[PDB]
Symmetry: D2
Subunit: 198 residues, 4 copies
Amino acid sequence: KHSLPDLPYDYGALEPHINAQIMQLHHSKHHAAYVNNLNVTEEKYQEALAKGDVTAQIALQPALKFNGGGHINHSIFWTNLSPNGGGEPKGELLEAIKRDFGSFDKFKEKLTAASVGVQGSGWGWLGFNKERGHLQIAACPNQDPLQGTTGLIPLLGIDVAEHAYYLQYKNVRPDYLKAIWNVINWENVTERYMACKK
Amino acid sequence: KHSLPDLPYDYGALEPHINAQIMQLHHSKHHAAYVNNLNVTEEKYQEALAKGDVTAQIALQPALKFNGGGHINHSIFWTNLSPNGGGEPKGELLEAIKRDFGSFDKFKEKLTAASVGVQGSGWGWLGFNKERGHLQIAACPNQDPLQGTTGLIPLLGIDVAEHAYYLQYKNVRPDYLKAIWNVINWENVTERYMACKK
Amino acid sequence: KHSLPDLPYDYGALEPHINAQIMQLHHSKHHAAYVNNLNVTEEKYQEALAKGDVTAQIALQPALKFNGGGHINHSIFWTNLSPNGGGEPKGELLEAIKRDFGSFDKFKEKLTAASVGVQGSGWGWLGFNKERGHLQIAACPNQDPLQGTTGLIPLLGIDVAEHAYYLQYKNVRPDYLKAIWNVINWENVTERYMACKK
Amino acid sequence: KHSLPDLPYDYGALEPHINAQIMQLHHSKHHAAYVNNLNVTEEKYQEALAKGDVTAQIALQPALKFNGGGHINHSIFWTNLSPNGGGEPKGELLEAIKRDFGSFDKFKEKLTAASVGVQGSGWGWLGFNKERGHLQIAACPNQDPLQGTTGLIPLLGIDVAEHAYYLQYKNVRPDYLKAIWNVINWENVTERYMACKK
Ligand SMILES: [Mn+2]
Ligand SMILES: [Mn+2]
Ligand SMILES: [Mn+2]
Ligand SMILES: [Mn+2]
C-alpha cells in the first residue's frame, strides 16, 4: 500500500517563493489524491492480472500512469525543495552542470525554458542519463514520470501544472520558475546525482 | 490576422458561478496569448509553406494546434456562457438530448463525468455527429479542438484547465462543473445545433 | 498463462483472398510472439506490482499494451474469418447495420475507409457502443485493443498492419480490403453482436 | 512542388541484402505516394491558411506529418545506402561514435536495438544533437521525421516499417537489420555529420 509522505518542512516554509496555501493544497489534496487513486488502480490491476484479463489491464493503464506518475513526481518534488535552499550546488554535480550545460546560468536557462515550454500540464526535469553517463534535461506531460517513460534518473523536478503556482502567480508561469530557484534543495539533488553515479 | 473577441458580457457577469478574476484572466491573458501565439505560428507556416520546408511545417504543428486550438475552443466557450443562462434547453436540441442521452439529467451527468474525467488539462464537449446525425459527448486533451480532431461539431464546451476554475474552486473541479450549469447559454447551444442540422 | 489459439481452419482455407503463406506467418509467428511476449511481460508486471515498483509498472505499459492487444486482436481476428464467410449477415445484426450506417454496402465502405485510412500499422473495427446502444466504427493504432482503449465491444476487426497483406497485395492495401470481405465470418460477428445485447 | 528523387543506384544495386523487388516498390510506390499526397495536402493547407481556417489546418496535420515525414525520411534513407556501402566510417565521425557509444560495434547494437525495438511502423535514427554537440540515437514512430519532431539532425536512418523488409525477411526484422549494415553509405553519413559541425 502506497502512502502519502509527510512534507519535510512546514507548509509555509517556502515563503515567499511558493506560498502556504499552494503547498498545503498541493500536498494534502493533489498528492493525497494520487496515492489514493494509485492504490485503487493497483488493486484492480492485481485482480485483472490474476484473472488474465488483458483488456482490463490495458484499460487501467491511463489511471495507473497518471496517478502512479503523480505519486512518483510529487514525492521527489517535496525533497527537491527546502526553506534553506537556493544558491548553486557544489562539487561534482556542479562540475557536471558547467560541463553538460556550459554554466550554471545556462543550466537554469535551459531547465526554465523546458518548464515554461510545457503546453498544458507537465514537469521540467534535470535527469541523469545512465547509458551516456551525463546530465540531460527533459519535459514530461501531465504526470508521466521521468524514469518510467524516459529511463532518465530524476534529480530535480519542477511542476508546471497550474495548481503548482496559479493561486500565487496566476498565468505568469515565468515568475514562478524565477522564484522557485530560491528554494531548490541542492543537497538532495546532489544526493540523487551521486546515487546513480555509483 | 486572428483577433481576440470581446467577451459578450461583463467580466463579473457570471458571478457567483465563475468569479470576475477568473473571467478577466481567462479572457485578457490566456485567450489573448493563444491569438498572439497563433498569429505568430501561422506567419511562420506561411513562410515554411512558401519555401517547401516540410521539417519546419511539422515542427510548427504542436504550437499551431495548441494555440489555434486554444483560440477555437475559447471563442466558442465565451458564447456558451451567459449571465442570464441556466435551466434547460428547449425544442429539438432538448428532444435530441432526451433521446441521445435519455434525460437532461443523464446528459448533465455524462458531460460532467467526461469533464471531471479529464486527467491534466482539457475540455469536455457536447458535439454533433454529422455522419451519424446525432449528439455525442467527447473529451479533448489540453487545447486540441473538437472538430479539428474529432470531426464532431462543437455545441457546448466546458474548460477544465485549472486556470478555468482554480482561483475560485481550487482542486474541487466537481463544484466548478456543478456551478457552471447555472450560466450555460442554451440559446447559443440551440443555435449551434440547428446550424449543423440543416 | 495465455496460450496461442489454434486457427478454426487450415492456413490455406482462405485462398485466394488471403494466401496460405500469410495466414501461416501471421498465426504461427506474429501471434505466437505476442503470446510468449505477453506472458513474459505480465510476469515482470506481477513482480513490479508486488514490490510496489510504480516506475517499473509504467515502463512495462508499452510492451503490455502492444503484446496484450496483439493477442486480443488476433484472437478475435481469426474467428472473424471463415473459408465459408462472405456475403451479408442477417436478422438483427443486418438491421442494426442499416439503422446505423444506411445500408450494408455503405457500412463496408465506412469500415473500408477507416481501415485504409490507418497511417502506419493498425486496425479497423466494427464495434458496439454499450452506452449509446448502437454500432460504431473505429480505428486503433498498432495493436491497441478496441475494448481496452475505447470501451467499444469488438464485433469485426480488420488488421491493416502490413504483415497482414503485404506479401500478397504489396502496397495496394485497398485490394486487400476488397478481398477480405469475401471471407468475413458473419456468423461469428452476429454471435459477438448478440452477446453484447443488454 | 515536391518531387520524387531518383535513387542514386539501380533497384537491384543492394542485392542480396535488400532485394530489387523491395527497393522498387519502396521507391516507385511508397515514396511516390508520399510525394503526391504531400503536394495535395500542402495545397489544402495553403488554402486553409489563407482563409484563416484553423480547424482545417489542424485536421490536415496527420496527413501532413505522415506524408511530409515519409518524404523527408525516405529521401534521406536512399542516400544513406550504397551498393558499395558497409564497413566502418573514418576520421571524425568514427571518433564521435567511439566517444558517444563506446565503440562502433556498440553503436551498431544500440541503433539495432532501437530499430528492432519499434512497435508498429517506424524508424531508428543516428542523429546529431546540435545543442549538446554530440551524437544521439532515437526512434521515431510511423513517418514522423527526426528533425521536425526531435530537433536532432538526421545522419543515418533505418526504416523498420514492414514494407521495407517483409517480402524478404518476413517477420524476422533482426535479419533485416543485420543485413542492412552491409550497404550503409558511410560516405553520405559522414557528409551529413560534417555538415552539422558548428
Ligand atoms: Mn502537481
Ligand atoms: Mn482555458
Ligand atoms: Mn497482425
Ligand atoms: Mn518506408
